[PDB]
Amino acid sequence: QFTDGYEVKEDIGVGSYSVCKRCIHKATNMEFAVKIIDKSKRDPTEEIEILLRYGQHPNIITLKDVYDDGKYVYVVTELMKGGELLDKILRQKFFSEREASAVLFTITKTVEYLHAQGVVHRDLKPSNILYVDESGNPESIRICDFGFAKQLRAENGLLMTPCYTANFVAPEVLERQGYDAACDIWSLGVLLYTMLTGYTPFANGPDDTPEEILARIGSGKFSLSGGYWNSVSDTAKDLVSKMLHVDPHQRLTAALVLRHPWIVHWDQLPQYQLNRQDAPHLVKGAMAATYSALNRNQ
Numbered sequence: 001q002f003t004d005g006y007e008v009k010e011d012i013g014v015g016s017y018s019v020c021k022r023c024i025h026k027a028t029n030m031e032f033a034v035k036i037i038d039k040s041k042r043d044p045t046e047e048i049e050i051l052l053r054y055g056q057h058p059n060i061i062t063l064k065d066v067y068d069d070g071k072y073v074y075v076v077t078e079l080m081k082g083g084e085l086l087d088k089i090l091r092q093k094f095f096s097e098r099e100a101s102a103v104l105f106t107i108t109k110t111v112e113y114l115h116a117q118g119v120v121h122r123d124l125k126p127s128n129i130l131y132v133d134e135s136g137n138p139e140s141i142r143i144c145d146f147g148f149a150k151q152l153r154a155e156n157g158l159l160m161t162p163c164y165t166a167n168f169v170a171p172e173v174l175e176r177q178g179y180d181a182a183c184d185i186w187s188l189g190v191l192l193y194t195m196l197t198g199y200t201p202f203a204n205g206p207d208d209t210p211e212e213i214l215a216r217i218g219s220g221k222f223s224l225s226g227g228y229w230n231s232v233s234d235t236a237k238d239l240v241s242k243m244l245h246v247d248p249h250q251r252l253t254a255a256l257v258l259r260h261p262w263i264v265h266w267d268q269l270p271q272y273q274l275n276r277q278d279a280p281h282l283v284k285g286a287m288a289a290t291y292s293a294l295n296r297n298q
C-alpha cells in the first residue's frame with residue numbers, strides 16, 4: 001500500500017540494486033523522493049534502521065515513510081531540490097574560504113555525531129551531499145544515501161558505540177570500522193580541496209585511468225601551492241594535508257577536524273572570492289573516476 005498514499009512520478013536515479021523516483025503525497029500534494037530497493041538483490045535493513053535512528057539530525061536526509069510489499073522496500077525521504085552541494089558551490093564565482101569553512105563545519109559536525117554513535121557512512125562522496133532547497137545556507141545541507149553505511153555491533157548482534165567496548169566485537173570488525181571512519185574523513189578532504197581550488201586532488205577528468213588515480217592516492221603527496229592555491233590560507237592547506245593524509249592512523253578524526261583553527265576561527269578567514277578553476281562538469285567526471293578507481297573491489 002505505498003501507492004494508496006503516494007503517486008509515483010519520474011526517476012531521479014537508477015542502478016542495478018535500487019531505483020529512486022520522485023513521488024507526491026496524495027493527501028497533501030507535497031513532493032517527496034522514494035528509493036525502491038529489490039529485497040531479492042539487497043538487504044536494506046541496516047540503511048532503514050540508520051535513517052530511523054539518526055535521520056532527525058538536521059543535516060542527514062530525513063525519512064518520512066517506509067513500505068515493504070514482500071518484494072520491494074519503499075523508503076520515502078525528503079526530496080532534495082537544491083542539487084549536489086559541490087556542483088552548486090563550484091558554480092558560485094564569489095565563494096570564499098569563510099563560506100567553505102562553514103560548509104565543512106556543518107558536514108563534519110554531522111559525521112562526528114554519526115561516528116560517535118558507531119555509524120560509518122562508507123560512501124561519502126560529493127555526489128551524496130546535497131542541498132534540500134536553494135536558500136544556500138549550511139542549514140539546508142543533507143548527507144544522503146546511507147545504502148553502504150554500517151552500525152558498529154557486537155558478535156551477538158548488540159548495537160555498540162565506540163565509547164562502550166565492554167562486549168565482544170571481533171577485532172577484524174573493529175579494525176575495519178577504524179579504516180571505514182578514516183575514509184569518511186579522507187572524502188571530506190577530497191571535498192575541501194576541490195571547494196577551495198575548483199579541481200580534484202587525484203584526477204584531472206573522467207578519462208584518467210584508475211591506475212594513475214590510485215598511484216597519486218598511494219603517493220600521499222598533492223599540490224598545496226600554485227595558481228589556485230597561492231592566495232589560500234596556510235591553515236586551510238594544513239587541514240587539507242591532514243584530512244588527506246595517506247596513513248589513516250595519522251589522518252584527522254572528525255573530532256580533530258572540528259578543533260582545527262580553520263574551522264574554529266572562521267571569523268579570521270577571507271570573505272572575498274577564492275581563485276579557482278571553473279570546470280564543474282570536468283570535476284564531476286574526475287570525482288566519478290576517483291571513486292570508480294577506489295571501489296573496483298567492492
Ligand code: NA
Nearest residue numbers: 055057060062
Ligand atoms: Na534530517
